[PDB]
Amino acid sequence: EFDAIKIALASPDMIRSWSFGEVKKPETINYRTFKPERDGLFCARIFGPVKDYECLCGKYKRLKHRGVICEKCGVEVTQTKVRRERMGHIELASPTAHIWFLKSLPSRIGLLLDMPLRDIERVLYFESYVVIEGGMTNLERQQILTEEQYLDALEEFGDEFDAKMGAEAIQALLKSMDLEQECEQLREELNETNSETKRKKLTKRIKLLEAFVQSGNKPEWMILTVLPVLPPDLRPLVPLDGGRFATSDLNDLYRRVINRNNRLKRLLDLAAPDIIVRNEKRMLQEAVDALLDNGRRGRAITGSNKRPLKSLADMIKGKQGRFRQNLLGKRVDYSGRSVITVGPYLRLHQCGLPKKMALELFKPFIYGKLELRGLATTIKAAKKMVEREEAVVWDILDEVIREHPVLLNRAPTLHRLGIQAFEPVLIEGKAIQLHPLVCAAYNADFDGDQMAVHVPLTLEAQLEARALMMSTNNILSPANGEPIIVPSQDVVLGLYYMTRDCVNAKGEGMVLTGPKEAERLYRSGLASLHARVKVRITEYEKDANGELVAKTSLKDTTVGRAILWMIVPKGLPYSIVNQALGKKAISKMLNTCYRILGLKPTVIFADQIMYTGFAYAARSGASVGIDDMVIPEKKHEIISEAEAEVAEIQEQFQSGLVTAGERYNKVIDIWAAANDRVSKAMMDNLQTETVINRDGQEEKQVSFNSIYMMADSGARGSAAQIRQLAGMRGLMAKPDGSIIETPITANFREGLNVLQYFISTHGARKGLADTALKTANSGYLTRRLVDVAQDLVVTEDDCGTHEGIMMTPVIEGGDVKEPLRDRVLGRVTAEDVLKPGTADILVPRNTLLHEQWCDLLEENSVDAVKVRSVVSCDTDFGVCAHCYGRDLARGHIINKGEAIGVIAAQSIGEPGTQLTMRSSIQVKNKGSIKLSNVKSVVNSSGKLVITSRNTELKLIDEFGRTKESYKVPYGAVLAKGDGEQVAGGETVANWDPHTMPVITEVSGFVRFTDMIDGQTITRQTDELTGLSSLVVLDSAERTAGGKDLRPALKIVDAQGNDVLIPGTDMPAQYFLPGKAIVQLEDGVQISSGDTLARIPQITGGLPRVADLFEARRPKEPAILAEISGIVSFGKETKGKRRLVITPVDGSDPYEEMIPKWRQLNVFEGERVERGDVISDGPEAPHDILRLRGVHAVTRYIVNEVQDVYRLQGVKINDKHIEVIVRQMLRKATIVNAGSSDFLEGEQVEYSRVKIANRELEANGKVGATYSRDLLGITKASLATESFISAASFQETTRVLTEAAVAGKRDELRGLKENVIVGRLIPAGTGYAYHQDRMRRR
Amino acid sequence: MHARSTGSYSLVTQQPLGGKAQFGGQRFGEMEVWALEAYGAAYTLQEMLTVKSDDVNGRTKMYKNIVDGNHQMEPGMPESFNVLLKEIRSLGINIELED
Amino acid sequence: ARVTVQDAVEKIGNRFDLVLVAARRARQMQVGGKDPLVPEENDKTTVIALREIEEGLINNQILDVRERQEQQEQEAAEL
RNA sequence: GCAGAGGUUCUAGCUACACCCUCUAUAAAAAACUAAGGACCACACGAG
DNA sequence: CTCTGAATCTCTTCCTCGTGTGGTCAGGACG
DNA sequence: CGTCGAAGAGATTCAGAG
């Protein structure tokens, strides 16, 4: 129908072309007469007739008179909708500069003339002359002049030239200059420029000039002379309110501008003095500025009631502007609202609906059905009978409701499952029912929550809300494969109470024919629900491919478990309904049923399980009583002993033995220990203490306490809350983040004191106030993440690439956080994974990995498996299908087209609500110690000593899997040796954390190179070791003479020769860092491992995730090695330490300035590699990307996010993080232009440059080299491909001005540029239609 | 309970006019559009955005199509976009549509 | 009535192609006068298409062949 | 409204997207066809 | 002395649906 | 009877030494 849109600066002739008339009269309408004024802002002649096919004089009133402009009233008779399309223009008497092109950040009107903004502000406001056409003078064309100085210039220069004033002067300056002329001289100046800052400013200016000269623009157009007016119906207007017509809108600004212009015209034809004309022109400019954007100046023009009245620019941007209020989120018809109800009976594919609501929703359908029946002759009669609510209407309504899904939409739909479909079931009452099992995905309580009901109208919508949105279609959440319909509160408790055992209940030891008989033996009351018995069960097996094998063995279980057997389908084995069946067991049971039985036999199972759970939680009578919450007897004694211990520490502090801080820490620690002790006592008196008879003596058995059963089953609450119900509350936090000295020693079953409640209110207030910020920040993070990806769609089925990011299990030193069987599952390998037996290809290179493959991978025990990921895919404008892996919603490869750009953004921004906003290392288990890339040196004590910090302590068993990882300090001493099996419990590394050892690579004597005792090292008398210890003076503390010299240690023999490092000619030089306490003397042999110098020595909240995605530079960035080379110094920290790194192969032009306070873990004798760390500290994403490729920034920016998300327990699959990473580093920069037409300094999208260079290489000419770049989400979104895609996200004024100046046409092709326009989005079912249409072109 | 099918519209022809004592349709807010885009559903999104909300030649067409018997659709183009075009064109910036 | 459509999406793998291939069948049953090949029973005209697809009686090729035959029949009457 | 005119009714009813009927100078015999003017700001409330 | 980085000043944005009350120009003669 | 706080990026300011 129409191609993409384009935006360009509006020419003064185009505005005249647009307008239908010309407004000269400020008054909108006569107050006395409703009809609008002839020259008024509301005008019949200009902006069409007021009523349909009616003039103003009433001469013509019928359609036969259409198209003929009346001569009496003067309005061209036509429909009223023409009143929202016609436009009018005011003719300003003095040229007026646009405010959007003046006060914006780069200030294009300033960049176009190369003059300060302040001078333009002065001349634009009639207080400073600017020289125009200076000629052969001492005044330049860009010179700023003052009134008195202008008068002096007039007296001095008799020639007729004179500096102008006002916006006319700027317009004349813009017209006089030639854009094409300055380009060549600017290019020459840039080439001759000796610096990069000046050349960068020149590149900005030259880019602006090129943008102007390419598109069809005229700089003079930035100063509008004729100004258009909005159409009348576009004015909000006032409804009849008794005769006031009052509201604050644009009409005030339009009236004031017209008044100012008319006054200016009158003054100009009256030959007013310049002192008055200048003031009038300044007032007119201020009025135009206020109209276009009220508030771009310091003064904000305001009407009555002292409120800043809205302007045009205020009705585009912001949460109130069109782009986020009327274009994206349109309110819809055929809607509804009501409160929630349990709705237990309806199956999980249907939901309730009040009759009094479904009658109003489906009104047109009822009209159509009545017309078909012949009951109503016309629509009027149908409306009458519908309002009658008689018997026939309900029968009709029970037809249009049969198979018509409706969308039950929750209010804050954070993720995809928020809005689901349901099949209506008409009920009485006035509340919307809801299947209980779906009250978890909605996160919908029943404390009066409110859902909104929508209706699909078209046939395609009805089919879509059936094939995609029905509650039986999305069982597994898109964030992770785990099911989302896990039984939640009552059904789980009922199942847990069903699956248990009491050691002596009636009907113990009996033999039962089968579950059909067990249900009867329990209903009769002859046998209790829990009783260990012997039953026979027909366990069906799917071991034969596609066949069900029936085996029956006399299995021993309880009556309750046996009754539960009939509910489960036949395929599942019996090793699932035999255990205690908490909550996680139920979720795993559902998952296995889905995995090995499909979907159709899992919906029925999950619907039947709720019925059984409710029915056997109702018979249980699981009530809570006071006697349940037992207070352990040990609590009083523990309290008394803790009081005694704190009193002892208090007496010690009063004796001066201990410090205040030390005593405070001791008190906190002992109180924590006492709290843990009392909690353990209460738990042991809660779970085990039940004792009963086994037909003989007493026996022990897990408790039946209701409070305990609501915690073990996981139905509601954990052990932490029960700790607050029976044991002591513990230590509470002050509002400032400190721990109060005295913990609350009273539980909730007991009385709580006044002080122990006033203390407790601090935490409640803080936690309740944090909701109003956690949600406010998670919303913004989710919005940025959505609008940064927003366009990823799986369009191609195979990239065909080869490289994929590595995948390895992640361990922090404890138990393995994530096995390789968890992360890898659902993805596709890159290279052929090999069996541990070499030259054996276990799995091909391009096969997807499902469960039957991960099980095989467990047998061979392989740790490193290459996996293709969406960061290395090469398909432009969309990721591949293979590169994305399993859809994670249905266990098959993702279909060609699914919108994965928004799925990941929703799945990452969803857990942002529950997320919190804020020696000796002992081995875990027996195994062999393996040190990767270690340079071990044997010390005097015989203990293993690592040379560099980069070596990490790891343990390897017979399977080769790293059980743990330990960070160890540089030059430390380790108890155990590498390549040696160690026992569990004992520490493999022991060292003093305060002391930093400084060991040498090789053994030998010490020689003080470039060292003088008293210049670089000042010997400090040590009162402990009995010997003055050589202490290195700090670089900023030592004298400048010693600054030139470099304090170092050299290894030498017994004769005096210098011993070279093995491999390198230059001898090993060990630079002694400042404030190093060396025990040995100058000329004493060093043991390889002995400590030469004993030197005394994240935020898991949402801000960490935000800073990670934003690619913000850390506060103290660790510097790295750009190119592999040998470390060298060029200066002596003259203001800053100087570092020069040169490769042994090629000479280096790269020298690095180093701050003098940054410790250098490298030595000038050491040779660094590319990407090697120089100074320790946090790393910067920008540095990593340009040093270690693109694959390396992912392994960090995904590991850190997962580390943040693992603490709270939430799980998000890695690919959802990876697509955001891919959308971040989408822009690229070209190092050299090559044969392409791109200017070397400009930034172009990676896809465009990749396609361009590939096409160039298709011919003889070589392509352009490129360097990848990283941008934060909030800056990458604003610099996207389309201007209208980023003009609805943030900073509307800047984006629109930048687009208009450059004439940046759009191409749509996105998911928001099509939502705004209102056509088929190219995301889902519309992808085929868009593909087709593209093929048409 | 508030549900409505058809009724009075606003100046920007966003028909629901705001659910209150006066008739209104619950806002298909910004996040609900993302929740629709997450699925493959686009036709229902188009009918939430064009025919239901604001399309002067879409509402009066489908109100006749439904009672006729066929559930078809014609997108038109939202009046809010024709408002945004005017609010940018009246700013001294010429924004148009190609063909 | 059908609640789980997994049987249908095996015939039309995309499950985005399924909706587009069932909408045409439903239109040919609402506007067009053609009769469903599956035995209709009280069901609306939007699940009959899914029922036909489940039986394998309809796919993206059969309906195109049928409309081509309709075009040929119309050409026969043109003479 | 075949064009002009009038129209049962089931507000108003050759355009709002409209539509149909009978009749020959002007209204009166008849059934089938549609859904309207509502801005901004403060305070309080609920839920996630 | 001229960038070198280093302060220093300026513009931006800070969730998402409802349920309700109340208050409100512009600009008063003028011939 | 009309009619006359916060917090972060970025663009100015601005600086220090060899």
Ligand SMILES: NCc1c[nH]c2nc(N)[nH]c(=O)c12
């Ligand atoms: N209002 C008079 C009248 C009666 N019947 C009508 N039928 C149509 N189509 N239009 C009309 O105006 C009338």
Ligand SMILES: [Mg+2]
């Ligand atoms: Mg609630």
